[PDB]
């Protein structure tokens, strides 16, 4: 229970942190380049022929 509380807090902190950094760069007249994604979901959708 307590650890899940902490995890939810961390998720919200990360989201508002990214938003805040973007706004700070916008106000300072620069562009903050988002960090590249580290996880991808891959779904095979084509059958194995040819």
């Amino acid at each position: 229970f307590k650890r899940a509380e902490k995890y939810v807090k961390e998720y919200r902190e990360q989201e508002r942190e990214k938003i805040r950094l973007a706004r700070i760069a916008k106000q300072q007249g620069s562009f903050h380049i988002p960090a590249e994604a580290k996880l991808v979901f891959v779904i095979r959708i084509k059958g194995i022929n040819k």
């Binding site: 307590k2 650890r3 902490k6 995890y7």
Partner: protein, 62 residues
């Protein structure tokens, strides 16, 4: 907790005895002191904590 993140421990039966083991596991997970198959290196985590305490990375007084 603030210094090493360390999400809340399971103190387990009694207090102070196996909480050290949980603390070492969490510190090894955070730092990156993992073993061969991912098992945390409790010895490495403990020695890192000892070195940090010696170097004054943690606060404390009597």
């Amino acid at each position: 907790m603030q210094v090493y993140d360390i999400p809340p421990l399971l103190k387990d039966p009694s207090q102070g005895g196996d909480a050290t083991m949980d603390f070492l596991v969490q510190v090894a997970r955070k730092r990156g002191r993992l073993g061969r198959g991912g098992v945390p290196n409790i010895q490495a985590a403990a020695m890192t904590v000892v070195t940090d305490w010696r170097d004054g990375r943690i606060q404390g007084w009597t």
